[PDB]
Design a protein around this nucleic acid. Structure first.
Lengths: 386, 136, 93, 138, 61
RNA sequence: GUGAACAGCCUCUAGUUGAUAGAAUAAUGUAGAUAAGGGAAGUCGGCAAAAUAGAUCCGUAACUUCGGGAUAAGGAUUGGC
RNA sequence: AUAACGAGAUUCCCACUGUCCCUAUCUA
RNA sequence: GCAGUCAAGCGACAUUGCUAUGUCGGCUCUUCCUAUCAUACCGAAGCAGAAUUCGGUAA
RNA sequence: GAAUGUUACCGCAAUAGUAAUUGAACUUAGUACGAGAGGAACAGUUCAUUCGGAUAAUUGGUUUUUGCGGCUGUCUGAUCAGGCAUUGCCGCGAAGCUACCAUCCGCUGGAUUAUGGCUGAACGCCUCUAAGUCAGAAUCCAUGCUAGAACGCGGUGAUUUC
RNA sequence: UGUACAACGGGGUAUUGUAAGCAGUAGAGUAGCCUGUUGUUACGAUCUGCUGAGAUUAAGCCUUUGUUGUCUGAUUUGU
């Protein structure tokens, strides 16, 4: 029986099983080629989604029918405050895959990461690094031995960094530890650069830059138990079918006498880690620079933050990265930014993105003004003024 | 894209599926057009072919001069009447969906076009723009 | 620039901006000196009503409004006449 | 780029916002948000709606005509884009905005003048007609 | 007897994920325990050392 | 009381608070709804839904056993003072 | 030995509409 | 198929005239086969270009 | 989800699945080809069809925010302010949800099928094959992504005087 | 036991649409007294000014130089 018709299978079979992620932090699987001819530099960064906004860009794409035209498009804003190194990991190649040799921590750690090691922190005595700190000092030798061991046997060096959550408007107060592979100079150079950065902070403009292409890796929005109709896009039954109509009716044949794994049963939807690539960065922002949302074609001394703040999010107040399109995960969610992972040479990557105007109207509703000054000028003085 | 198109087609909302009635906009004598199929559309299971502004479709005249009835000829949609995304950043829609009849070569049967003509249709079809007294 | 806080520059961009701006400045000086912006109206006046009397009258009016609102609320809460009749005070102890 | 004035409210319509309508009359109508578009689709008259600038202009709630508003016009004749003229216009726009705000505040004050006397008279009427309440108060 | 019983976070104490709050059974058990404690006190046993060595429940008519 | 009406709804006299319930609003169901453009292109088949619904005035064809069709069809109005 | 009328059987036209394109949302 | 035809072996290839009595069908679903319709890569065809025929692996 | 001395954090990956897909547009170029008719390669560049993963930036859709206003019957003596008419009705309507009805994205190395060969006997020539070997498919294996063996594994901090 | 947390309150941003009440030489028109010919005093749906006024604002919006309150409740874990 050929069923008289051929149709593509509903849903991609590669993204299975559709189960909830084990952690809100989407761990990075693969790092770039790590060519040791370049200077030591980071391979990824941690940021928090801070809603989206619109951008009008004077497209200069040659050959396209939008060449030299003005095109409006969506851009996502991610809060990316500076990151502080708090350790290094030395990895030694083994026949059974890469293995962690040893981990070296910094001289002192902020309460943000100490909190990450406890679940009853307020009840905790806060003994995070009482002895390790004592072991670091009084000889300058114990750590140096670990550094020498890493230099001798390590092959890829990963830097332990965490986000400055206290700087973000989130009430979480807990930082997110992550391992970022070190590219560039030899592993000895990698560890030497990481060692000098102990307890220091790393900005974001030194990793990424305008026109750079990055890959977004984060946990998608959760939706709970979902029917097959929305989980896989199954077509609805005509009407009032017996024992339901919003479900797949036929599950399988008599032979085999078992339900095939690919028949797209209903179950959990969302909250699955996903990876997206080829996302072009439109603007790199700084919290210390006024008029972050300004442009050469706008002249308005206004911040990217929309009037009244973002929806379900506070004010940026820190460095941020502007990226076109949509990024997996909801607002105020930890998202890790990763390089393109390959030597992209498409004209889109080579394109220069010079923003013409940035939308800062309130996202709380049908916003009509970009700044409170415009609203005051339009509406004028009110009763409450006098 | 069929013959007569001088560029790529923008992705716009589907306004007229198969069987949709669109008013005429030329002096050819026809008054309404019945869409039977859409040229350049990739047919898929359960998915009714649908056109949009600037698309070329095959239709049979239902009202107007009887000489044009019962025959199917290519037609170009000049008005969509369904909101579509313009790259200028405006969600614009037309009062009434309308189309014009033309040969596969793109030559307009009518000497002139009446009423507004969509930008995405005039730009893609030089003959429509030349025979259209109004754009947007 | 092509844009400002509002009312795009291309609407204002015209030859001889300086002359019109100077004319507007002259118009503004023809009003500031004349007292057009009479923002110094910090005190009112009536038929001999002193500050103490007017302040007392305003305070009494505000108190009367508050008392009337409180009485309205009390009547609305206590009446409940839409469902049943109120008890007779004569028979109550 | 071009900020458009709402047909129903005259509010600034930034790019990528609202809906535009094109009629067989070959003219375009722009609405900032869905509210104004729906109101227009009902054939309502903005001059009769209190929440649109048309009524305020007709009702005189705000200064309808002023010398500052003459600067803003549809420049059908372009300019040669002189660098000095750009800076002069940049300063002039801010100065004109400040002057217009001052004039609007003055107009609002002139419109609202006299409310103090009415409030005082109302307070006097309330006080005079409520002797028992005052007696119980003290 | 835990077939198709709902899950509760309070079961981590005893490991078993399935647990419930049988208020009536708990009331009867505590009443019986109070009666046993009263009997022990009348006998002369030390309440501090008292522990429930044996407890048996079986179906009734 | 509204309303032509004992049509539908509220209220007075009179009579009841009896249907195991606490928390959440996952999928799927039961009952009732809304939806941009096309308007049956779906289906064995206009299955279900929808559309007109009262009153005043104009007007009302073929057939016919002249009694009916007929509220044919199709049109204009409905509030308050 | 053919008028009216029909919870009679079938065909077609206007309005119409989530049957469908293509599904989405809400209430108990 | 009928009736011939000659002949390497013990009759192959070639060769002569004409010549419905049953109920299965459709909406959704997953998977598998190639005896490849389309897409990738090639050879032969009067392939000058364009277009087209066949053939080989490839699901 | 018990047992892995306890808890917690960061990691490797045995293994299973796997995806992208197809046509158009500029230049090549009215150029090679061609008497004329007509009419192409490659490389570079730009979109779209189907499918898949995300997300509300903008717009569409929902109203129990019963959020704000108006409408009818009825009731509280009238105004105000309110109850019922199974969510009373009508207009708008944020937050939420969602739509090619709205937006973004969907990588590149090795080995191979047929095929072209190189050397080279078998056969004192010849040969693409017997040895070896150069390439060559949307193919296979890989890069990447999905889950992580609950009895696969590594590193690190704390490890209960009372 | 402190950029600690929670309930309110103040602002920003939004939704709707001009609240009660007051006064009017606006108000089709109809009535007492009077004696006009803008008489006056009464009813009068609506309209006008306070009044882009009034109301809600997170239950999954942003902020908080303020007010009030909270900060030792049980169990288990050992190479």
């Amino acid at each position: 029986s050929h069923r008289k018709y051929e149709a593509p299978r509903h849903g991609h079979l590669g993204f299975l099983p559709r189960k909830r992620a084990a952690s809100i932090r989407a761990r990075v699987k693969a790092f770039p080629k790590d060519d040791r001819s370049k200077p030591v530099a980071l391979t990824s960064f941690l940021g928090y989604k801070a809603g989206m906004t619109t951008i009008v860009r004077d497209l200069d794409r040659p050959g396209s029918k939008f060449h030299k035209r003005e095109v409006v498009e969506a851009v996502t804003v991610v809060d990316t405050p500076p990151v502080v190194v708090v350790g290094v990991v030395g990895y030694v190649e083994t026949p059974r895959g890469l293995r962690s040799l040893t981990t070296v921590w910094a001289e002192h750690l902020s309460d943000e990461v100490k909190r990450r090691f406890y679940k009853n922190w307020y009840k905790s005595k806060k003994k995070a690094f009482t002895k390790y700190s004592a072991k670091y000092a009084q000889d300058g030798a114990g750590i140096e031995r670990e550094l020498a061991r890493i230099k001798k046997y390590a092959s890829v060096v990963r830097v332990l960094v965490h986000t400055q959550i206290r700087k973000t408007p989130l009430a979480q107060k807990k930082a997110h530890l992550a391992e970022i592979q070190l590219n560039g100079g030899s592993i000895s150079e990698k560890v030497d650069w990481a060692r000098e950065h102990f307890e220091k902070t790393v900005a974001v403009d030194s990793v990424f830059e305008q026109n750079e292409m990055i890959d977004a890796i984060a946990v998608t929005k959760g939706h709970g138990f979902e029917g097959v109709t929305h989980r896989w896009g199954t077509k609805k039954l005509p009407r009032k079918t017996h024992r339901g109509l919003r479900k797949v009716a036929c599950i399988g044949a008599w032979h085999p006498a078992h339900v095939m794994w690919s028949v797209a049963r209903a179950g959990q939807r969302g909250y699955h880690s996903r990876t997206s690539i080829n996302h072009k960065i439109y603007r790199v922002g700084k919290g210390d620079d006024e008029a972050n949302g300004a442009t050469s074609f706008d002249r308005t001394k206004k911040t990217i933050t929309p009037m009244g703040g973002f929806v379900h999010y506070g004010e940026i107040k820190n460095d941020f990265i502007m990226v076109k399109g949509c990024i997996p995960g909801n607002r105020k969610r930890i998202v890790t930014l990763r390089k393109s992972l390959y030597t992209n040479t498409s004209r889109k990557a080579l394109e220069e993105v010079s923003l013409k105007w940035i939308d800062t109207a309130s996202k709380f509703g049908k916003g009509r003004f970009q700044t409170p000054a415009e609203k005051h000028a339009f509406m004028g003085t009110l009763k409450k003024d006098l | 894209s069929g013959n007569g198109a001088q560029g790529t087609k923008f992705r716009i909302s589907l306004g007229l599926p198969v069987g949709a009635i669109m008013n005429c906009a030329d002096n050819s004598g026809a008054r309404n057009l019945y869409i039977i199929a859409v040229k350049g559309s990739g047919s898929r299971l359960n998915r009714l072919p649908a056109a949009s502004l600037g698309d070329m479709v095959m239709a049979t005249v239902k009202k107007g001069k009887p000489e044009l009835r019962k025959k199917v000829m290519p037609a170009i949609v000049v008005r969509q009447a369904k909101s579509w995304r313009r790259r200028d950043g405006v969600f614009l829609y037309f009062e009434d969906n309308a189309g014009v009849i033309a040969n596969p070569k793109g030559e307009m049967k009518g000497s002139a076009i009446t009423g507004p003509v969509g930008k995405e249709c005039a730009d893609l079809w030089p003959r429509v723009a030349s025979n259209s007294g109004v754009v947007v | 620039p092509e844009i400002l806080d509002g009312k795009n520059v291309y609407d204002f961009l015209d030859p001889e901006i300086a002359a019109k701006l100077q004319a507007l400045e002259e118009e503004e000086e023809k009003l500031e000196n004349e007292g057009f912006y009479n923002s110094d109206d910090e005190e009112e006046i009536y038929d001999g009503f002193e500050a103490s009397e007017v302040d007392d009258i305003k305070e009494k009016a505000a108190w009367i409004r508050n008392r009337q609102k409180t009485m309205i609320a009390e009547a609305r809460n206590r009446k409940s006449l839409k469902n049943k009749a109120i008890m007779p005070r004569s028979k109550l102890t | 780029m071009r900020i458009y004035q709402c047909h129903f409210c005259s509010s600034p319509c930034y790019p990528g916002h609202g809906i535009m309508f094109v009629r067989n009359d070959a003219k375009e109508f722009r609405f900032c948000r869905s509210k104004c578009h729906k109101a227009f689709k009902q054939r309502r008259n903005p001059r009769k709606l209190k929440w649109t600038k048309a009524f305020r202009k007709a009702a005189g709630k705000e200064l309808a005509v002023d010398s500052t508003l003459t600067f803003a016009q549809r420049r059908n004749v372009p300019v040669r884009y002189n660098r000095e003229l750009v800076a002069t216009t940049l300063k002039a726009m801010a100065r004109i905005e400040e002057i217009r705000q001052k004039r609007e505040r003055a107009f609002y004050k002139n419109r609202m003048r006299g409310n103090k006397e009415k409030d005082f008279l109302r307070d006097k009427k309330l006080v005079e007609s409520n002797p028992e309440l005052l007696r119980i108060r003290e | 007897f835990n077939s198709s019983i709902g899950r509760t976070a309070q079961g981590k104490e005893f490991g078993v994920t399935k647990a419930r709050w049988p208020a009536k059974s708990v009331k009867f058990v505590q009443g019986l325990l109070q009666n046993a404690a009263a009997n022990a006190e009348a006998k002369g046993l030390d309440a501090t050392k008292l522990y429930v060595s044996h407890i048996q429940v079986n179906q009734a008519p």
